[model samples]
Target: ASRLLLNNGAKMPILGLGTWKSPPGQVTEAVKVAIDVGYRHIDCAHVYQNENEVGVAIQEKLREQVVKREELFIVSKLWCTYHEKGLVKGACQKTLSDLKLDYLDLYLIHWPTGFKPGKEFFPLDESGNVVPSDTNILDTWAAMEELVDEGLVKAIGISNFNHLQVEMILNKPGLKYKPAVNQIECHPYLTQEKLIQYCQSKGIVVTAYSPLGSPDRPWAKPEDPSLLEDPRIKAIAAKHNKTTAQVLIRFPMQRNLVVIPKSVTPERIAENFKVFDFELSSQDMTTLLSYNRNWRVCALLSCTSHKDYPFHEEF
Candidate 1:
């Protein structure tokens, strides 16, 4: 139940459960089991395609008095197709309906790239590639700022945005609200120290997604390396009598970043919850960070052609 304060003074859990790629059949049970084990934060998105099931479990938890609405931190993200300024409110309302929640604790732009606003998630061109839109992120941010005034969300943020992209929003002349958090791919291999420090300097909380190296990512190749199997991480885990998964899971936390390691398995969910029991020493944290290779596992390959693709610049 460790918490961090956002720029606007909102309290956020430093660890949570990520729902990306979670199958529909098992996500509800997974969420209930997570809450039963003391997880108050549940990371979700309209793009994840399982929020309805996740919502059902949360409703039951509230009904049984296991938790109350005010006690939980439920976050959802707006998909790329909903980034048009006119569509922003309706998109969030749709997410609210699917999640069965009156208001979200945090809401984010799912990606920097925008697509044509429509019923289809991936509106395609004649060549079958994802269609890009003329929508600007600053325009979308303006619309999101109104959500707070409208009482639909407590905080607003961005995900998968790079340093320069964030700079554009931060330096906007008429910016109404600053992003409270930035969710991104971070782990031992892609430590993101510079970006994490930069965001912190700007009062933006950093939430690490794919903290266990995203072994469950569907696009992973057979030849790809696994973070938990790395010898460097294994040595640290052995020194501390922890599993390699535990070491990988705890790496980002040591850097003062929030982390969400996706897991549907009850035992691993319990295991992931135990990182606060022991602390990683400053030396252990530095030694693990020295192994960084600046790798990214969640590269949005489909949107590389868009005008706002953000991976070209360094932090």
Candidate 2:
């Protein structure tokens, strides 16, 4: 129920239901259960391809009077395929239509890289490399600023942007609105302290995307380390009589970073929200911070060739 004040002066719920890997048939009930469990923020994206079902649950909740549209903070991202200046609005409109809303509470530029514009989400050649677009982020941001003026979205931000990419936007001439948030992958393995500090210093709220290290990520290999199975976190969780997920989710909330942990299971969804009751000791927090190995679970290998690929930066 806690909220963070954005640079635009809009309040966003700190804990949101992430719908990235949440599938179609189950995401609706997952969303419905989330709303009933007192979640006011729902994170969605055009690339997720399940916004229609998420919208169904949202509409049902609205009609049932479980929550008001104004009280809820619904967020969706503009996909890389739609980063062209002319395509931004149309992409946002599609998400709005699918979510059955006139406007979104927060709209984010999904990634720093831009893909070739078209119906194909990932336009790849026979060699299987992504076809990149030359559209600069500033041009895309210019189009995004217009959406705010047109009343299409309440706040606009960027996701997966590195510190320099964020600085580029901040230093743009005649900038209308500063980015309200920079949603990035954050967890014990990738603490993201430098970027978080940088954004906060500039009055941008940082949202932690894969707070549990994204064990459910599709491309995860068998040899990859699992944050949930990390013994240090388990020790802390056992000390508090909570699940390792609870510790992972709390790690960000305690740092004042907005966190979105995805889960479709009834019990896991409820468990993810139970972090408010327990407090991680200062030692526990310090121990968690020591686990940072600069590991990234959501590394988009397909975008590595793009000129604006963000992760190459030191931050």
Candidate 3:
């Protein structure tokens, strides 16, 4: 039940149920199971394309008085396709309709880049073409600010954005709001220390996605290294009498960063949510920190041809 307070005075749970790869039919059931297991925060996105299922589960919980609307903290994202000034509001509205919610507890710009609407993924034209829309991130952020003004969202944040991207939005004129949070990938292998420190300096809460290194992600290669199997992490887990997944989740939460670990199975979901019961010692935490290799498993630069893909620079 630990929480992080946003600059706007909204309390966000440090641990959230991530719904990235939770497929259509299974996502709803997983969400309900998480709710029953005491998870009030949920991280969702339009790209997931399962908001309808998540919405159905949330509404059922509400109707059953399992959790009140205000009690649950819902986090969703604005996909790259809706960065155009004219399209932003409608895009957020579409998610609202899909989720059957009056307002989102927190809404994030899914990525810094923009794309054409209705496309399931980014790089819309597929010819490595950058569409000139004049609706870059700063303008989109203005539209996001307006969402708060319109009371459609309680708070706003950015995701998958680097320092430069975040700075671009912050440097805009007539800004009514600063980003309340930044959701990024962080695990023992890819600590992202500098970026996390920068965000903290700006009073922005950092949410760690792929906290358990996304072992179940379809895009993950079998040859890719498994964070769960790392001997150092395994040692720490054993010392704490915890599972490696618990060590992963507890690590970030201990650093005061929000974590959203996804799982569809009932036991795994419940096990992942049980981080509050144990704590990592200073020595173990330092040992885990020393395991940082600047290893980012999810490199968007290689995935897409965006001109400003973040991982290109030396971190």
Candidate 4:
């Protein structure tokens, strides 16, 4: 329920419900419960393939007067296929229609990598590699700036961008607006200190995704360590009388970054919001940071071959 100010003068709720793996059949109720449990920010994406269902819950809440349209902060992203200058608005409008909303509180470039533009979401080749697009990020950003001008989205930002890409945008000539937020994967395993500091110093708010280590992620391996199961985190959670998931969710919240933890289960959804009632100690925070091993749950490995792959940079 806390809020942070974006560079664009918009207030974004510090905590949001992440809908990455929420299926269409379940996301509607998941969203409805989140709203009832006092969540205002709902993070959605076109690539997630459930915006239409998420919209149903939002409309239901609106009709019931549980919350007004403006009281909510709804976010969506432009898929990589829409990164071309001419195709940007088409993607944004489709998202608005699917969500049954006139304007989005925040819209982001989902990833820096651009796929060959077409109806095919993956745009893959015979070998199953994504066909790359030659569209420059600068051109894609310029197109995004126009969406803000048209008032289709209240603010625009970037996601999964590395420090160099962020710097390039800041250094662009005649830049209309700097990114309001840079949403990246952050958890105890990937503390993301330098990147967060860089974005914050430049007036960009950083949002942490996969804060619980995204154990449900499709690419997860049986041997991959779990953030929730870590004894260090378990100790901190015990000290605070919270679940490890709660501690992980609060990690970014305490660090002053916006955090969106995904869940469709009703109890966990409610449990994640209880973080506002407790605080992690300074020592606990430092201990958590010490656990960082530069590990990432949402590596986006399939796009590593793209020229703009972000993780190649040190930050």
Candidate 5:
């Protein structure tokens, strides 16, 4: 139950339940189970389209006085289609409405990239080609600042964003607030050491998504290498008497990064939240750090028509 304080003065739980691929039918129950356990932080997104279920569970908990709103840290992200200057606030409002919450502990621009509105997932044209919109992210961020001023969101940040993209926003004029955090696809195979270090230096907390290497990812290819199975990770887990998933989660937590590992199954959800029960040795930490192969599993190009996605390049 350790916490990391954001630049905006918000205390973020180091560990959170990621609701990314939580089965649609069972997500509500999963949220309840997570709460019943020791999870106080919940990471959600509009793209997941399951906020209503999550909201219902939270409401039930509140009605029963299981936990107060201030005691819980709820994080949600805005979808790409709503990244326009005029749509940002309304999009955040809609998410708040869906979650049945008065304010969001954290609201993030889901992606630095933008797409046209009225489209599901990725925007498409008449010919089914992906269409990129003219909406600049900084403009959308300005609107996000307005949401903070109005008190609809306690803090705001960006997700799936690169350092250059973050620099662009940070360099903009009339910027009211710096991004409190940046959520990205991070794990042993894709341990973003430099990026995480840079963000931390800027006082921006970094949150790791797909921290377990997303073994259950719906779109993961049949031949995709699993981080949990990586020999290095397994070795560290063995040395620490922890599961591979536990090693992955503890790696980032030890580095002070917020990590969200998703699970809907009863046993797995409970297991994922038990990371705080153990610690990783310094030698094991060094060995695990050597497992970075720069293997990014969730490339944004798969969700876009960009022929030359940045992931294709060797970083």
Candidate 6:
């Protein structure tokens, strides 16, 4: 399998199985099925509330000798509520325990926004809105560095952070580590070409989350334009005898961005992993970019009440 070499000399599989919104009932088998089909990378998060389920499958697979613990690249994230300096390690420990791993290949600060520390994935105020905390990401990032020193995680990075926020981390005096990757929302509809280029220039790998246009995202409206259904994309897919979802997955991987496309169904899980068998031509790439409407599928506007919510910029 092709892998992205992180700044810290770690190798991450170029394509991974994204487990966001994966139902608890299916994620266990989904992980097992994904591993059976040659997927070595599994993207997970504490907020997804299924790491325990993923852990059960991982334990079963390791016991079954399907894939050794060392051979697989497991990535999990620290949710916003744990961004405070004092809470980072505890949060990471919980995820490590849930995933039943000694160390995570990559651990990300799930979002730039901070929620009041608690058990709540979506902490709320009495008025029924997301409560915001002033915990600066710098404080959270410093704690993340400590996790690396303490051997809790291998590589630490930021997710949903814009270019300027990244710069702040990079420019901090006496910085011990630079972020290995910047995971963000990306697909043909949200091409993010400039941001990808900038991150690479800084030795930061870009990982595209929601890389499928997130057709099944909970907030999707019936009237929304579907990237898979886009006429131009479909024409290109037909030209290449591929599915539109495959083209979308290939777009980022071909551009050197790690893509994690989520799917729980057995057939789509297998189909999504088949992208490495082909290539998209230059003209086909151009056609996909032409459809970039700068659209976002997972904008976390509910957290805009937080001063650090990330979607305000075009990055």
TM-scores of all models? 0.97, 0.98, 0.95, 0.98, 0.94, 0.97
Q: Which residue ranges in model 4 land beyond 4 Å of their true spot?
A: none
lDDT of 1 by residue, 122-164 (tens): 8998988899889988988998999999999999999989998
The global C-alpha lDDT for each of the candidates, from Candidate 1 onward, is 0.89, 0.93, 0.87, 0.92, 0.84, 0.89
Q: Name the regions of candidate 1 deviating beyond 4 angstroms.
A: none
- What lDDT does candidate 3 reach at residue 97? 91
Question: What's the CA error at residue 23 for candidate 4, in Å?
Answer: 1.1
| Candidate 6 local lDDT, 1-315, one digit each (tens) | 889899999899998999989999999999999999999999999989899999888889999999998889999888988888888999999999998989998999889888887777888888889988888878889999999999999999989899888988999877998999899988888889888888999999999998778888888899998888888888888887889888889999888999999998999999998888888988888877877889888788787657897777767
Error of 4 at 313 (Å): 0.8
**Model 3: worst 10 consecutive residues (lDDT sum):** 124-133
- What are the candidates' C-alpha RMSDs? 1.1, 0.8, 1.7, 0.9, 2.0, 1.1
Q: Tell me which residue pairs clash in candidate 2.
A: none
Off by over 4 Å in 6: none
lDDT of 3 by residue, 17-70 (tens): 999889999999999999999999999998898999999999999999999988
**Model 1 residue 25 distance off true place after TM-score fit, in angstroms:** 0.7
Error of 5 at 3 (Å): 0.3
Better candidate number, 5 or 6, judged by lDDT: 6
User: What's the C-alpha lDDT at position 106 in model 5?
Assistant: 94
